[PDB]
Structure formats: structure tokens, C-alpha cells
Amino acid sequence: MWELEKDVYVVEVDWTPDAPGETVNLTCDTPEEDDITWTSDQRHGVIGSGKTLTITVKEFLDAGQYTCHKGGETLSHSHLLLHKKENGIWSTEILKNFKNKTFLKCEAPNYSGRFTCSWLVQRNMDLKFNIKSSSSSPDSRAVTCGMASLSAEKVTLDQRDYEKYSVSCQEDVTCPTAEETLPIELALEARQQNKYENYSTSFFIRDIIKPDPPKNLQMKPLKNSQVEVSWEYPDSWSTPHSYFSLKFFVRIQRKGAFLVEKTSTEVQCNVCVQAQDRYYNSSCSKWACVPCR
Amino acid sequence: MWELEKDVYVVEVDWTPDAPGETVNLTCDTPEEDDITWTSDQRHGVIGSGKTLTITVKEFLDAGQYTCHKGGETLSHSHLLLHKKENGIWSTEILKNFKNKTFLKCEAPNYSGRFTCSWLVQRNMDLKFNIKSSSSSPDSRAVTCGMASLSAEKVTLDQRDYEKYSVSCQEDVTCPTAEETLPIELALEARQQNKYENYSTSFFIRDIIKPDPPKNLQMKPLKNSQVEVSWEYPDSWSTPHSYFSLKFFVRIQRGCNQKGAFLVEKTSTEVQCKGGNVCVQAQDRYYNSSCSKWACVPCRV
Ligand SMILES: *[C@@H]1O[C@H](CO)[C@@H](O[C@@H]2O[C@H](CO)[C@@H](O[C@@H]3O[C@H](CO[C@H]4O[C@H](CO[C@H]5O[C@H](CO)[C@@H](O)[C@H](O)[C@@H]5O)[C@@H](O)[C@H](O[C@H]5O[C@H](CO)[C@@H](O)[C@H](O)[C@@H]5O)[C@@H]4O)[C@@H](O)[C@H](O[C@H]4O[C@H](CO)[C@@H](O)[C@H](O)[C@@H]4O)[C@@H]3O)[C@H](O)[C@H]2NC(C)=O)[C@H](O)[C@H]1NC(C)=O
Numbered sequence: 001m002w003e004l005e006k007d008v009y010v011v012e013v014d015w016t017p018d019a020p021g022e023t024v025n026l027t028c029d030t031p032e033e034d035d036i037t038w039t040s041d042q043r044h045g046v047i048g049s050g051k052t053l054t055i056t057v058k059e060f061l062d063a064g065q066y067t068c069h070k071g072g073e074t075l076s077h078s079h080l081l082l083h084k085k086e087n088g089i090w091s092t093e094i095l096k097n098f099k100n101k102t103f104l105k106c107e108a109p110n111y112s113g114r115f116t117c118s119w120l121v122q123r124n125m126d127l128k129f130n131i132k133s134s135s136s137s138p139d140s141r142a143v144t145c146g147m148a149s150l151s152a153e154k155v156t157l158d159q160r161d162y163e164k165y166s167v168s169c170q171e172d173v174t175c176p177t178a179e180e181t182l183p184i185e186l187a188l189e190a191r192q193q194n195k196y197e198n199y200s201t202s203f204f205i206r207d208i209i210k211p212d213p214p215k216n217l218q219m220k221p222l223k224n225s226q227v228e229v230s231w232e233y234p235d236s237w238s239t240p241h242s243y244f245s246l247k248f249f250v251r252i253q254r255k256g257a258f259l260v261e262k263t264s265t266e267v268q269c270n271v272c273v274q275a276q277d278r279y280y281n282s283s284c285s286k287w288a289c290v291p292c293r
Numbered sequence: 294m295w296e297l298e299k300d301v302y303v304v305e306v307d308w309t310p311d312a313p314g315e316t317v318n319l320t321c322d323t324p325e326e327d328d329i330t331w332t333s334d335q336r337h338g339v340i341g342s343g344k345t346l347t348i349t350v351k352e353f354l355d356a357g358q359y360t361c362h363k364g365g366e367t368l369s370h371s372h373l374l375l376h377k378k379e380n381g382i383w384s385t386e387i388l389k390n391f392k393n394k395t396f397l398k399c400e401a402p403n404y405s406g407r408f409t410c411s412w413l414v415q416r417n418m419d420l421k422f423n424i425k426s427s428s429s430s431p432d433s434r435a436v437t438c439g440m441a442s443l444s445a446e447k448v449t450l451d452q453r454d455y456e457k458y459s460v461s462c463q464e465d466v467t468c469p470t471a472e473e474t475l476p477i478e479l480a481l482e483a484r485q486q487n488k489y490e491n492y493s494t495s496f497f498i499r500d501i502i503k504p505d506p507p508k509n510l511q512m513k514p515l516k517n518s519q520v521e522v523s524w525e526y527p528d529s530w531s532t533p534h535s536y537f538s539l540k541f542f543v544r545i546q547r548g549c550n551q552k553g554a555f556l557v558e559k560t561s562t563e564v565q566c567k568g569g570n571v572c573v574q575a576q577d578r579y580y581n582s583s584c585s586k587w588a589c590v591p592c593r594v
């Protein structure tokens with residue numbers, strides 16, 4: 001057993017059919033010692049007595065809020081969370097894994113340090129999330145995450161849909177030109193009723209880069225059918241643009257798209273264009289399209 | 294009065310004609326209390342007695358090394374330095390100021406944190422220097438300076454020459470990309486015989502930048518008299534070169550000397566000279582800091 005927060009405890013449990021439950025002692029935080037009574041928010045009536053209650057916790061009915069009582073007045077109360085372990089494996093039932101069997105998908109528009117992570121949920125009901133820096137050493141990269149939000153978009157995998165969640169985070173210390181020598185190691189804590197699970201990931205910001213679409217994609221004709229198309233870097237992108245250079249791909253929407261490093265080209269013809277980091281093969285941006293007219 | 298180092302004290306003195314000198318008590322660092330006598334390395338014979346010597350210090354003869362004695366044997370000794378103050382202003386007589394009336398001139402070849410400061414001296418005799426971080430707060434910029442060295446070069450100002458000194462320094466904490474939020478505050482301690490003075494300066498490394506000359510300035514002709522000249526960034530310059538960009542100036546030889554040079558951001562150009570020298574200097578693309586020394590080659594093919 002281990003403490004998640006004040007008077008909230010997590011109990012690791014083996015979920016095999018004939019598993020021996022964990023015996024856990026829960027003492028009351030009070031000076032009195034007589035007439036002490038215990039109750040549960042799952043079971044009806046008195047389920048124990050004495051300042052310290054000793055119980056065998058295997059099923060979820062053994063979880064919930066345990067309250068002390070003496071002489072009709074309430075005292076302290078402790079909460080028990082369950083962490084399932086089946087076949088030696090920690091349960092992964094709150095989250096729905098992506099096609100690649102991973103759970104967390106993060107993406108960043110620039111090297112500033114800001115990024116967002118998102119996840120899927122199997123059933124959006126009675127959920128509680130909490131994200132933080134896994135490693136807490138001095139030579140670790142400190143991260144300050146925001147609050148998790150339910151997304152309007154519903155992902156469709158197999159032939160089934162799933163609600164998506166998302167959270168924004170910012171990296172504490174940065175020196176933009178420098179190379180990242182160790183990754184950002186994250187850990188997601190998930191609660192659902194009295195079930196506890198947690199998911200971890202490590203990554204470098206460079207691998208999660210996804211620029212924003214190019215702005216002001218304008219047109220100007222020249223001669224019969226030939227036309228020059230121009231645009232400009234997005235406002236979100238890192239500066240200076242001489243350092244965070246970009247390579248753009250140009251396709252024609254009625255793969256086979258051709259790369260152009262300048263911010264304009266002439267071609268005969270929808271005209272769609274996406275962006276990518278010039279020097280690193282990171283994720284490309286969303287397409288910015290305009291009619292070939 | 295205040296202690297500079299073990300048994301070396303500094304005495305601030307008002308140098309007006311009729312100023313009352315500061316009376317300072319000097320006790321001996323010894324357990325004995327009898328038969329105690331004092332001497333000076335300036336005055337002849339015994340100049341005092343008693344465990345504690347009380348004197349009025351106004352002129353420089355009142356300075357120097359004061360030694361204790363008992364029965365012909367030497368005891369401890371303390372050294373006194375004077376800081377002159379005239380019309381409320383602290384004296385600046387050991388160093389010779391540059392044309393711009395400043396005393397310290399520093400220059401750095403890159404944003405690494407390394408840089409050097411130099412000064413002139415009025416009389417190169419019996420000198421002792423020491424440079425350090427003036428502010429000693431947590432949010433100050435810590436700097437580790439070296440030892441002052443006599444330079445071979447002798448500057449000539451007006452119609453008179455002066456010996457030059459220089460010292461190299463490195464900033465404790467650095468992050469090439471980092472923004473400068475507070476300046477480097479330095480302080481030079483200068484000693485000359487029994488005279489004490491000190492000079493202070495504040496600056497951002499960006500303002501003292503002076504790049505090294507561009508390397509490998511090659512030529513290759515093309516057409517009549519026309520020829521393309523190419524080069525590359527100096528090895529000393531900060532990396533990556535994509536971030537620490539430069540602006541180059543190109544002149545034709547028959548801080549920044551900006552009279553008939555034309556700017557070129559690329560590392561090569563084509564130009565007509567048909568003989569002579571082609572000189573080129575460098576500068577930071579984004580900041581108007583000091584330019585580098587010229588790199589010249591003959592316009593020959
Ligand atoms: C560049 O050059 C300038 C010019 O030389 C130089 O400037 C000076 O810097 C030095 C060192 O930083 C300063 O010296 C310090 O002065 C401190 C203050 O001293 C005064 O106040 C004392 C008050 O004592 C009373 O009040 C307290 C209240 O708390 C009480 O307890 C006491 O009992 C007492 O009642 C006073 O006593 C003292 O008097 C002495 O000095 C005067 C002359 O100033 C003299 O006339 C007296 O006879 C007597 O000798 C003075 O008036 C002082 O506290 C400090 O010393 C302590 O702290 C150090 C910390 O390291 C301890 O090691 C040490 O043991 C003491 O506890 C120190 O002496 C000096 O005042 C500056 N002068 C000026 C004009 O600014 C710069 O530093 C140079 N720059 C660089 C980078 O080198």
C-alpha cells in the first residue's frame with residue numbers, strides 16, 4: 001500500500017482467481033482509543049471496530065471511503081484505491097490504446113518547450129486524471145502541466161468510436177539552440193471510481209514536432225496556365241526563421257508532391273501545401289489549400 | 294580603515310590642503326605587552342612605542358610597512374595604503390584614460406563568455422593588480438578572471454607613449470542562446486607603491502564583441518577583370534553558424550571603418566578590381582557591434 005494524497009491510499013492487488021489478498025492495517029488519526037467504530041461507503045452498517053482495522057482487500061467492495069466513529073461523532077476517514085495486477089501485468093482498462101498499441105500521443109508546434117498530450121478513454125464516466133514529472137532529480141527536465149480537458153472530437157478506431165482527452169504542458173528550462181541530451185519522461189495517473197492505473201512515456205521534443213499550416217497562400221498568374229504560388233511561415237513557428245528553417249511539400253488536389261525550400265514556386269495546374277523541418281524528418285503540418293483558379 | 298588582506302589595511306584620506314587626518318590605532322598581533330617598539334620602512338629609526346601605536350595619517354610618509362620590535366627581534370608587521378579623495382572625488386592617477394576618457398576597454402571574439410580587458414598605466418613601476426566580480430549577490434553574474442600581464446605593445450597617444458596591460462576572463466554560467474538580463478559588473482583594484490585606487494565598469498558581452506578576421510579568402514577569375522571572391526567564417530566564432538549569423542563588408546584596397554565598403558551577407562561575391570587589394574571585414578548580422586580586423590588579398594589572376 002502507498003499514499004497518493006492525504007488520506008487517500010492505493011492498494012496493489014493480484015486479480016487471479018485464487019490469489020491471496022493483501023492484508024492492510026488502517027489506523028485512525030485521533031487520540032481516543034475506546035468505543036471506536038468503522039464503516040464503509042460500500043457495505044451497510046458497521047464492518048469493524050478498534051482504532052486499527054485489519055482487513056483483506058481483494059475485490060472492489062473492499063474499497064471506498066472508510067469512516068471512523070465514536071459516540072455518534074465522526075472522526076477521520078481513509079480512502080482505498082485498487083491497482084489491478086493480472087498475470088503479473090498491470091491492468092490497462094481505463095485507456096484505449098492507439099493503432100501502435102501506445103496510449104499517449106503528444107505533439108508540439110515549435111521548440112519553445114510547450115506541447116500537448118492526448119489520450120483515449122474506453123468509457124467516459126467518473127474519471128480523474130493527473131499528470132506530472134515522473135523523475136524528480138536535479139538533472140531532470142522539469143515540466144509544468146495544465147488541466148485535462150474532454151475533447152469534442154471522437155476518434156473512430158476499428159468500427160468503434162472513442163472520446164479523447166487532452167492537456168497542455170510547458171517545459172521549465174530551455175536554451176533553444178542546444179541539443180536535448182535526455183528525454184522528457186512523463187507519467188499519467190488515472191482514477192475511475194476506485195480503480196487506479198498509470199501510464200508512462202519518454203520522448204524528445206524534436207520527435208513530436210508538428211508545425212502549423214502556412215499562412216497567406218496567395219496567387220498571381222503569369223502566362224497561359226502557368227502560375228506562381230506564394231505563402232509565409234506560420235506565426236506559431238520558432239524564431240529566427242533563418243535557424244528553424246523549413247522544407248515545404250506541394251501537391252495538387254484534383255506521395256506525388258514535390259519539395260520546395262523557397263516560400264514560392266511556379267507550376268501549371270486545388271493546390272495543397274504542407275510544411276516540415278528542413279533539417280529533421282519530423283511530422284509534417286496540416287495542409288493549406290487554395291483553388292487553382 | 295579596512296583590511297585588504299592579512300596585515301594590509303586601506304585608509305581613506307581627504308587630500309585637501311587643510312584636512313584633518315584620520316587617527317587610526319594599530320595594535321600588535323602578539324601576546325607580549327612590554328618592551329614593544331615600532332619602525333617604518335619610510336622613516337629612519339624608532340617612530341613609536343607601546344603595544345598600540347596611534348598616528349594621524351595624511352601624507353604618504355605616514356604609509357608603508359609598520360613593524361613591531363622587542364629587544365632587537367622583529368614581531369608582526371602591517372602595511373597601510375592610502376586612497377586619495379580631493380574635492381569629493383576619488384583619485385585616478387595610476388591609470389591613463391583612453392581618448393574617450395574611459396580607463397578600461399574590453400573586447401570578446403564570441404559569445405562564449407570569454408573576454409579580455411586592457412588598461413594603460415601612467416608609470417610602470419611597483420604595480421600590483423587584481424580584478425574580480427564587483428557585486429557578490431546571488432543574482433549577480435559570477436566571473437573568474439586570470440592574472441594581469443605586461444603587454445609587449447606600447448600605445449602612443451597624443452605625442453607620448455604608455456605601457457598597456459591586459460587580462461582574460463571567463464563568465465561562470467553560460468547558455469549560448471540565453472538572453473542577457475543583467476550586465477557584467479567588474480571592479481579593478483590597482484596598487485602602486487602605497488597608493489590605492491579602484492575602477493568599475495558594467496557592460497553586456499554583446500557590446501564588446503569583435504570577431505576574428507574571415508579565413509580562406511580565395512579568388513577565381515571569370516571574365517574580363519571580373520572575378521569572384523569567397524571565404525568562410527573564422528574558427529573562433531560561436532556555433533552554430535546558422536544562429537550566430539554575420540554581416541560582411543567588402544572594400545578595395547588600392548571599430549567599423551564604414552566609408553566605401555559594400556555589404557554582402559553571403560560568403561562570396563563577384564566584383565571588378567583589375568588589380569590592387571580586396572579587403573573584407575565581418576560584423577554580427579543583427580547587432581551593430583564592433584567589426585573585425587581586415588582580411589586582405591591581392592586582386593590578381
Ligand atoms: C573601492 O574603494 C572604496 C574606497 O576605499 C572601497 O570602500 C569601502 O569598502 C569597505 C569594505 O567594503 C568599507 O569598510 C567597511 O565598513 C563597514 C562600516 O563601517 C562603519 O560603520 C561602523 C559602525 O559600527 C557601529 O554601528 C554598528 C551597528 O550595527 C554597531 O554594531 C557597532 O558597534 C558600531 O557602533 C563604524 O564602527 C566604522 O568605523 C570605523 O571606520 C571608520 C572609517 O569608515 C573610522 O573612522 C573608525 O575609527 C572605525 O575604524 C565605520 O564608520 C564595516 O562594518 C565593515 O567591517 C565589518 O564587516 C566585515 C565584513 O567582511 C568584517 O570582516 C569586519 O570584521 C567588520 O565586522 C568594513 O570595515 C568602507 O566603509 C567603504 N568605504 C566607502 C567610503 O564606501 C570599496 O570597497 C572598493 N571596492 C572594492 C571592490 O574593493
Ligand SMILES: *[C@@H]1O[C@H](CO)[C@@H](O[C@@H]2O[C@H](CO)[C@@H](O[C@@H]3O[C@H](CO[C@H]4O[C@H](CO)[C@@H](O)[C@H](O[C@H]5O[C@H](CO)[C@@H](O)[C@H](O)[C@@H]5O)[C@@H]4O)[C@@H](O)[C@H](O[C@H]4O[C@H](CO)[C@@H](O)[C@H](O)[C@@H]4O)[C@@H]3O)[C@H](O)[C@H]2NC(C)=O)[C@H](O)[C@H]1NC(C)=O
Nearest residue numbers: 001002003010011012022023024083134187189197198199
Ligand atoms: C505507478 O503505479 C505503481 C504501482 O502501484 C506505483 O508503484 C509503487 O510506488 C510506491 C511509491 O513510490 C512504492 O512505495 C514505497 O515503498 C517503499 C518500499 O517499501 C518496501 O520496503 C519496506 C522495507 O522496510 C517495507 O516496509 C514495505 O512494506 C509495506 O509495503 C508492502 C507492499 O509493498 C506491504 O505488504 C507491507 O505490509 C508494508 O505495508 C515495502 O515492502 C517505501 O519505503 C516507501 O515509503 C515511503 O513513502 C511513504 C509514502 O509517503 C511514506 O509514508 C514513508 O514514510 C516513506 O517515506 C513507499 O511506501 C511502491 O513500492 C511501488 N510499487 C511497485 C510495485 O513499484 C508507482 O509509484 C506509480 N507511478 C507514479 C509516478 O506514481
